[PDB]
Design a protein around this ligand. Structure first.
Ligand SMILES: Nc1nc2c(ncn2[C@@H]2O[C@H](COP(=O)(O)OP(=O)(O)NP(=O)(O)O)[C@@H](O)[C@H]2O)c(=O)[nH]1
Ligand SMILES: [Mg+2]
Ligand SMILES: [Zn+2]
Lengths: 421, 92, 242, 97, 96, 174, 225
């Protein structure tokens, strides 16, 4: 399985799923996606293994397809056998306006991302910048900046662009991240790219602490299976592991569990006890799941819902291990000065954020949650809001929250918060 | 007979321009192939001997005594000559 | 690209240049040119007074706020080279006010055309670069024919200043000197001397101006073109007295 | 919340305008794709009064609450629905010309 | 085709160059004078030269020639040649 | 206020320790204050401030923590020019240089008020202009000095006069 | 050059004086500092191997990637030395449709066949789109000259219709360029580019929402008897 999770950010029309298409060789669909045209809408996943090409740094020409390059067990570029280094997964986080909240949902899963910019547009759009501040909530260190299109326009405008971007970065986020040319519907200059990914180090994770999993996918029932045993070919809690080893035939608790309606004004939610049937990651089947990588943990019991993902921000652990369920979270919030995602003329001309006040529609993006909230209290201590959540959230950490508000039929990052609890 | 095509003299008024929409009382709305928006007129030897439609291209004149009063259609270019003009090197 | 807009502007620039004694100002009469420097001088004064370090176009009806610096700061005169050189020495007497205005407007002219010229330089530049790159292939990248217009224009442009204030240095002066540096590398000490001169001319507002931001080489075909072997050795159109 | 937001900002709501010709140089025009909630009588009766026209509030099977007008108007049947949250600027078909 | 060919110095006989030097026409640049100057410079030094590190006829002429060229070198603040050009021209033709 | 005093201290300490080890890189700091606005923000207010870097070491440690103080004190900093619009982006920048440079002279006399000598105020202001930390008007660095502090009020009318004549006297070229 | 000390009145006056002689010392000092500082950044000398190779990532950032991309983009021989000079902004050449006014009702378009060939799409499908927009009858057949019941004053203003078709169907939104070729992928999925091979899908008209009524009657009912 994958060891390291690599996401993708960038405004739409600068490529997202395009770079992924180059490497993996696969695409994502849901039918609806076609009908609106070049909106990705939900999230990508794919897997491409790393194996070092041993006389490759930047040779002049080879086949456009990446199978001469890694994701093969033999090399024709150096003409010698290959050797494993790494293995990656991919994730694709949207770049369209509306899709902010679902980018947030998939923003705490990842262990790095690629920023994508293109030469065919202006310097820094609004949505790009907003992506970046979104990251800094969950505080990724590694980041890589790219120019998707460099061969569609000249080798003049390219340079300028690069100089401007170069200036702007390492004056926001240090480390002086590199800015790199690529092509990826012409599928060239992967070798370059890949070399920079190789050097990105092993992260550390805990493999012996109580189980914790973050779910973002569900549904795999049928069509077919149709005949015989009859239906279906039960479901999943398809997501990442951060802590512990999820082995087969362990007993799992879903800690939001089945949501039950209010009985007058107070709601209750009861956990769902479920067993691991099988661990499936890629086309291979695992007997144990190591932290990192998307593992389709096979679930059991009853029908109804969890059609495409109604497991939005759900946490799975082991029996007798309970991340504490909170209906009310005391959020200590800090706001930004600029309402990013606004489009007027230029990004730098942006409008300023309005203060957080009583009785307003929020959101609250606690990790992978998208729970609706209304401010009931601004008072407890200054700059603390006691916010009541309709959809319950489970704390495993102190939680790093991005706060989104509606600006005009769409939410736009306003600030960040941390739960005191 | 004679030529069906003439060229602008940049001095003594006269600059190419294109009709936009038409307006009542013999006047029309007219726009410059470099400058900003304008209103035109027409001369009395073309008051219904010649019809200047919308998006037809023409040749103005300009007033000598005082600029930025109003301008006037003193000629018309037949569609045959418009394509030719626009090709060669000349107008946008 | 393109490049039609670029030709459409010189039309305009020819107009505005001639509108200015078409009619806007006549204000007061010269009256023989009292002197050329006096212009610069009392522009210096008026711009200092109410400063954004821009003045010019904005709030376009500053034509009033001479009245301020007239009735207050009323003398015996401040910037008094004028009254001295006149006889009768007018001070708050109406003529003086007219003079001041006539300066302000005649300068707004210079500036508002200068802008356009800067744009022209940029559009001259870009198509010459794109040209060069295409012929880089050859690795001797010719030719000197197409960019003599760039250079000759930047001369024209620059030497519009003896009269002028410092324009915005950020866009303008930079966009000139980098079409003489970044995209025409040349021997230094031509460079050094030239930038000193430009500071001199400019001054009466500001000296410095060191335009050192992003010189870059993908361009080095020159010397066999040298520095005056593209003047003596390749000019046909070549400035004349007036 | 977000769900509804998307399901609305990216699905359905698509706003048809069309122009045709009755004869010689006479013309006609329609609108379709406007929500049922809005009073059609109030929009039609505006268009009319702002220029010699002639409306209607026709209801046709599986296409209904469709309104037409007299004259060629395309520009102003787009313009008036732009500033007014009636067409997300994305759903604007013109079949004119 | 073509065929349109140029011309230049031309015939001016060594005795016509002696006597009349230089009778009009004169110049037209580009490249024209500059070429000639390159020639004179190199050809003068290139003789080695086998006497005439004395007598002071040499160092006179050589010095005077060297003093021609700073016009070519240092003339232009921008890309301008003011009319200062043809003083360079009158120099080189009086020299020759 | 927030009932979370501590990280405002760790802010200061991480701007002692990151310099100590390596003086080579100071980049991270630009994202450090983005997280940790809990007091009253501002760049050189909280970057000149430290622990023993900004107290006992202050004099020499100014010129031994140079680079990051040229990144915050001198400008907010951008490279922008346009042959399109760029008139209103003039004053956008200028207001934020205005506010910046000025109130860093508040911070100057607030460090020289735990390091009291009227003279040692004079010292620091020149060691700013000598380096790339400041290079702008001595108008700012005299007229601003008299008196920007009321956070420490009571050095007022003595430290005022000693803010210094040599500032003015080098200014005009006399 | 420049000293640092615990300055006092007298020592302050020294610094003042030194500057006043020439302002070169301070100026050129802080010209020299950023030189070696910026060298040290870009080629890297930073501690810890991962950030050392992070500024070595930075080192190979500096035109190196773009350089390999030069020779690459020249080696394809389809981004260089072609009709891109004008084909860039689509400045392509399209036959100028040419018309006839027959009967002062119908408009026959002679050049139909030639036009359809040029952007490499078939006959019936192109015809459909045109005739749908204008909401008229007429057919093609014949000697491949179209017929339409739409009446206009004779013009070059037929072009607007064609523009709509060409910017929906054929013209890719990657580069701006028609060499394009239609495909059959899944259901209601089509279109491919091939001059950079950035695939794009599009959908095909099947109108049937609202057409109004026009415009004689009696005859209508009579035929629909
Ligand atoms: N010529 C060229 N085309 C490119 C390049 N990168 C992407 N494309 C094209 O751009 C299209 C958009 O791809 P896609 O990745 O879906 O864009 P996206 O930004 O991911 N969509 P979304 O914003 O919704 O995520 C693809 O058809 C691809 O062919 C590039 O570098 N060059
Ligand atoms: Mg996509
Ligand atoms: Zn293409």
């Amino acid at each position: 399985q994958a060891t390291v999770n690599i996401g993708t950010i960038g405004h739409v029309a600068h490529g997202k799923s395009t770079v992924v298409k180059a490497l993996s060789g696969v695409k994502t669909q849901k039918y609806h996606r076609e009908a609106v045209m070049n909106i990705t809408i939900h999230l990508g996943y794919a897997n491409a293994k790393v194996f070092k090409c041993d006389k490759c740094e930047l040779p002049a020409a080879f086949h456009a397809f990446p199978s001469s390059q890694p994701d093969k067990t033999d090399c024709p570029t150096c003409g010698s056998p290959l050797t494993l280094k790494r293995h990656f997964s991919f994730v694709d986080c949207p770049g369209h306006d509306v899709l902010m909240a679902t980018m947030l949902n998939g923003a705490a899963i990842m262990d790095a991302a690629l920023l994508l910019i293109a030469a065919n547009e202006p310097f820094p759009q609004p949505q790009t910048l907003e992506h970046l501040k979104a990251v800094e909530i969950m505080r990724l260190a590694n980041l890589v900046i790219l120019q998707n299109k460099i061969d569609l326009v000249g080798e003049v405008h390219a340079q300028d662009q690069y100089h401007k971007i170069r200036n702007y970065i390492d004056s926001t986020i240090g480390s002086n991240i590199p800015i790199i040319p690529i092509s990826a519907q012409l599928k060239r200059n992967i070798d370059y790219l890949l070399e920079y990914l190789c050097h990105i180090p092993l992260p550390t994770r805990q493999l012996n602490c109580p189980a914790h999993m973050t779910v973002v996918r569900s549904f795999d029932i049928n069509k077919p299976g149709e005949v015989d045993i009859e239906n279906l070919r039960g479901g999943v809690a398809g997501g990442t592991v951060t802590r512990g080893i999820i082995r087969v035939n362990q007993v799992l608790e879903i800690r939001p569990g089945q949501v039950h309606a209010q009985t007058g004004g107070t709601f209750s939610c009861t956990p769902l006890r479920t067993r691991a049937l099988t661990l499936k990651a890629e086309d291979n089947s695992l007997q144990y799941a190591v932290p990192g990588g998307l593992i389709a943990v096979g679930t059991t019991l009853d029908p109804t819902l969890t059609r495409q993902d109604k497991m939005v921000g759900h946490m799975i652990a082991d029996e007798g291990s309970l991340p504490e369920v909170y209906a009310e979270i005391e959020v200590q919030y800090f706001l930004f000065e600029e309402m990013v995602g606004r489009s007027k003329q230029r990004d730098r001309n942006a409008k300023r954020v309005q203060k957080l006040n009583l009785q307003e529609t929020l959101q609250i993006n606690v990790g992978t949650l998208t729970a609706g909230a209304t401010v009931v209290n601004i008072t407890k201590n200054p700059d603390i809001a006691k916010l009541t959540l309709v959809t319950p959230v489970c704390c495993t950490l102190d939680e790093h929250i991005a706060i989104s508000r509606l600006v005009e039929k769409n939410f736009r990052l306003i600030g960040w918060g941390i739960i005191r609890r | 007979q004679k030529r069906d095509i003439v060229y602008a003299d940049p001095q003594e008024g006269e600059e190419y321009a294109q009709v936009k929409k038409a307006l009542g009382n013999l006047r029309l709305e007219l726009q410059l192939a470099d400058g900003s928006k304008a209103i035109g007129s027409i001369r009395g030897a073309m008051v219904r001997k010649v019809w200047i439609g919308q998006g037809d291209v023409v040749l103005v004149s300009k007033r000598s005594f005082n600029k930025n009063d109003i301008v006037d259609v003193i000629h018309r270019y037949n569609p045959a000559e418009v394509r030719a003009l626009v090709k060669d090197e000349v107008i946008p | 690209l393109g490049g039609s807009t670029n030709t459409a502007v010189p039309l305009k620039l020819e107009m505005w240049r001639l509108l200015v004694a078409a009619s806007q100002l006549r204000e007061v009469e010269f009256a023989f040119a009292m002197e050329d420097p006096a212009l610069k001088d009392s522009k210096g004064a008026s711009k200092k007074k109410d400063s954004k370090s821009e003045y010019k176009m904005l709030y376009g009806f500053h034509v009033i706020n001479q009245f301020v610096e007239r009735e207050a700061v009323k003398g015996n005169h401040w910037g008094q080279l004028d009254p001295l050189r006149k006889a009768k020495p007018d001070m708050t007497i109406v003529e003086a006010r007219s003079y001041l205005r006539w300066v302000y407007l005649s300068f707004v002219e210079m500036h508002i055309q200068l802008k356009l010229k800067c744009r022209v330089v940029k559009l001259q530049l870009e198509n010459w670069r794109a040209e060069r790159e295409r012929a880089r292939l050859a690795q001797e990248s010719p030719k000197i024919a197409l960019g003599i217009p760039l250079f000759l224009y930047c001369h024209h442009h620059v030497l519009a200043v003896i009269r002028d204030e410092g324009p915005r240095m950020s866009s303008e002066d930079i966009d000139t000197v980098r079409s003489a540096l970044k995209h025409f590398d040349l021997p230094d000490s031509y460079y050094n001397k030239l930038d000193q001169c430009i500071a001199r001319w400019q001054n009466m507002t500001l000296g410095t101006l060191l335009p050192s931001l992003l010189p870059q080489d993908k361009q080095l075909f020159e010397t066999p073109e040298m520095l005056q072997l593209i003047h003596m050795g390749h000019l046909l159109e070549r400035p004349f007295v007036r | 919340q977000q769900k509804r937001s998307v399901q609305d900002a990216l699905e359905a709501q698509k706003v048809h305008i069309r122009v045709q010709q009755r004869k010689g140089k006479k013309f006609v025009t329609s609108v379709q794709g406007l929500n049922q909630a809005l009073n059609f009588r109030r929009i039609s009766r505006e268009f009319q009064r702002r220029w010699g026209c002639n409306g209607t509030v026709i209801v046709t099977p599986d296409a209904g609450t469709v309104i037409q007008l007299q004259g060629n108007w395309s520009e102003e049947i787009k313009k008036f629905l732009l500033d007014e949250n009636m067409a997300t600027e994305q759903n604007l078909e013109i079949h004119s010309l | 085709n073509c065929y349109i060919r140029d011309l230049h110095p031309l015939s001016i006989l060594t005795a016509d160059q002696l006597q009349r030097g230089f009778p009009p026409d004169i110049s037209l640049v580009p490249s024209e004078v500059v070429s000639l100057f390159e020639k004179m410079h190199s050809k003068f030094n290139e003789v080695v030269w086998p006497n005439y590190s004395s007598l002071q006829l040499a160092k006179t002429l050589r010095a005077q020639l060297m003093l021609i060229e700073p016009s070519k070198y240092f003339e232009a603040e921008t890309y301008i040649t003011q009319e200062r050009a043809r003083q360079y021209e009158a120099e080189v033709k009086n020299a020759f | 206020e927030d009932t979370r005093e501590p990280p405002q201290k760790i802010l200061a300490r991480c701007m002692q320790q990151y310099p100590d080890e390596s003086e080579e890189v100071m980049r991270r700091c630009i994202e450090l204050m983005t997280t940790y606005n809990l007091k009253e923000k501002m760049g050189p207010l909280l970057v000149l401030d430290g622990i023993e870097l900004a107290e006992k070491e202050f004099m020499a440690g100014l010129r031994r923590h140079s680079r990051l103080l040229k990144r915050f004190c001198r400008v907010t900093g951008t490279a922008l020019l346009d042959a399109a619009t760029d008139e209103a982006t003039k004053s956008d920048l200028l207001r934020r240089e205005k506010r910046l440079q000025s109130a860093t002279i508040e911070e100057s006399a607030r460090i020289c008020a735990r390091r009291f000598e009227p003279e040692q105020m004079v010292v620091i202001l020149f060691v700013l202009f000598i380096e790339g930390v400041l290079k702008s008007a001595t108008i700012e660095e005299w007229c601003g000095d008299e008196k920007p502090i009321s956070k420490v009020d009571p050095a007022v009318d003595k430290k005022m006069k000693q803010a210094a004549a040599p500032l003015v006297e080098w200014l005009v070229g006399s | 050059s420049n000293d640092l000390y615990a300055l006092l009145k007298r020592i302050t006056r020294q610094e003042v004086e030194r500057r006043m002689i020439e302002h070169e010392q301070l100026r050129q000092k802080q010209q020299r500092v950023p030189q070696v500082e910026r060298f040290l950044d870009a080629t890297s000398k930073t501690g810890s191997s991962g950030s050392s190779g992070g500024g070595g990532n930075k080192a190979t950032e500096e035109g190196c990637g773009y350089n390999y991309s030069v020779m690459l983009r020249r080696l394809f021989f389809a981004l260089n030395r072609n009709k891109e000079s004008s084909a860039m902004t689509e400045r392509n050449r399209l036959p100028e449709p040419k018309l006839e006014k027959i009967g002062k009702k119908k408009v026959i378009i002679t050049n139909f066949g030639r036009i359809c060939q040029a952007f490499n799409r078939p006959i019936q499908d192109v015809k459909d789109y045109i005739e749908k927009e204008l909401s008229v009858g007429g057919n093609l057949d014949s000697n491949d000259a179209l017929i339409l019941k739409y009446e206009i004053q004779k013009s070059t203003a037929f072009d607007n219709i064609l523009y709509k078709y060409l910017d929906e169907f054929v013209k890719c939104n990657s580069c701006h360029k028609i060499d394009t070729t239609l495909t059959k992928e899944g259901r209601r999925m089509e279109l491919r580019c091939n001059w950079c091979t950035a695939t794009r899908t599009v959908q095909a008209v099947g109108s049937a929402t609202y057409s109004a009524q026009v415009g004689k009657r009696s005859k209508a009912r009579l035929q629909a008897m």
